[PDB]
RNA sequence: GGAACCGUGAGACAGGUGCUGCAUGGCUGUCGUCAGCUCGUGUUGUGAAAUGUUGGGUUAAGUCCCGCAACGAGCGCAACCCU
């Protein structure tokens, strides 16, 4: 299970771009950063982790959102260790509301790939072929992780409430729990299960995203494994 | 006896570039070949509406690229015919 006393990674972040709604989580600004209370972060870890093991052992799906280039690679690897979905590139208009029509773009993607592998690849004009390549590119970029969705999630995990604020809104009107590791620059009231921690920093986001993923595989039907996201921490 | 056309007598009836196109169909002229004009759904607003068609680069052009709650689509453009 998780370990306490993480005063060598997370803690405070962001200079003076804070939101007054985050005072109950700030220790005390010193020369620059506001600094977060590691004493309050722990109790949050427990409450947030408790609700986690609930949906984990309940066979509930989670959607890890991460558009920020600070945890772009971490959000995927963490979502790979477990059988969960994720959004790494960019968050479309009516993916859940207008599911049917949106999937028609997925079917065309699979239909074009089957036509690009070898079957009738260079039969028609090249201009029309180059047209199928662009469509594939555009489709593969936006339909990268939503291609595995065949039915409408139980919860969403964000890395920053403000950056993925759009994901927070749609998750609120739908009545879906929201887990996320945000800091001073945000509104905690929007997160029913918030984790006061550094939003940025690769070594910061990987810790929890790796511990949370580890707590998911355990208490489900799998054994704990070493985090491969640590190799990406060498970005420093 | 009787089909046909035809002529006279008799009956029932036609016809009108006669008016109104501000009662109209159809067709045509014109601003225009001028270049853009809109829709479905989502989001924002009490609402009329807005967003998307704004912004940066670029082009003969919403031509294209980049960014962006927008995602797609239709008429137009382009392409498909002839000299």
Curated annotation (Swiss-Prot):
GO terms for molecular function: structural constituent of ribosome; zinc ion binding. GO terms for cellular component: cytoplasm; cytosolic small ribosomal subunit. The modification N6-succinyllysine is found at residue 110. The keyword Ribonucleoprotein applies. GO terms for biological process: cytoplasmic translation; ribosomal small subunit assembly. Gene3D superfamilies: Glucose-6-phosphate isomerase like protein, domain 1 (3.40.50.10490), Helix hairpin bin (1.10.287.610). It holds the Pfam family Ribosomal_S2. InterPro entries: Ribosomal_uS2 (IPR001865), Ribosomal_uS2_bac/mit/plastid (IPR005706), Ribosomal_uS2_CS (IPR018130), Ribosomal_uS2_flav_dom_sf (IPR023591). Keywords: Ribonucleoprotein, Ribosomal protein. The keyword Ribonucleoprotein applies. Part of the 30S ribosomal subunit, contacts bS1. Some nascent polypeptide chains are able to cross-link to this protein in situ. In collided ribosomes contacts ribosome rescue factor SmrB. Required for ribosomal protein bS1 (rpsA) to bind to the 30S subunit. Belongs to the universal ribosomal protein uS2 family. This is Small ribosomal subunit protein uS2. The gene is rpsB.
């Amino acid at each position: 299970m998780r370990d306490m006393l993480k005063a060598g990674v997370h803690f405070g972040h962001q200079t003076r771009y804070w939101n007054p709604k985050m005072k109950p989580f700030i220790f005390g600004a010193r020369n620059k950063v506001h600094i977060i209370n590691l004493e309050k972060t722990v109790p949050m870890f427990n409450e947030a982790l408790a609700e986690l093991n609930k949906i984990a052992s309940r066979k509930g799906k989670i959607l890890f959102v991460g558009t920020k280039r600070a945890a772009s690679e971490a959000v995927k690897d963490a979502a790979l260790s477990c059988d969960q979905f994720f959004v790494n590139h960019r968050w479309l208009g009516g993916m859940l509301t207008n599911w049917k029509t949106v999937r028609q773009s997925i079917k065309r993607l699979k239909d074009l790939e089957t036509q690009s592998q070898d079957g009738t690849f260079d039969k028609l004009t090249k201009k029309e072929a180059l047209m199928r390549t662009r469509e594939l590119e555009k489709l593969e970029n936006s339909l990268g992780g939503i291609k595995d969705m065949g039915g409408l999630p139980d919860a969403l995990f964000v890395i920053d409430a403000d950056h993925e604020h759009i994901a927070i809104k749609e998750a609120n009107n739908l009545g879906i729990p929201v887990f996320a590791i945000v800091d001073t620059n945000s509104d905690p009231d929007g997160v029913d299960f918030v984790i006061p921690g550094n939003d940025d920093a690769i070594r910061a986001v990987t810790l929890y995203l790796g511990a949370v993923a580890a707590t998911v595989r355990e208490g489900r039907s799998q054994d704990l494994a070493s985090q491969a996201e640590e190799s990406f921490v060498e970005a420093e």
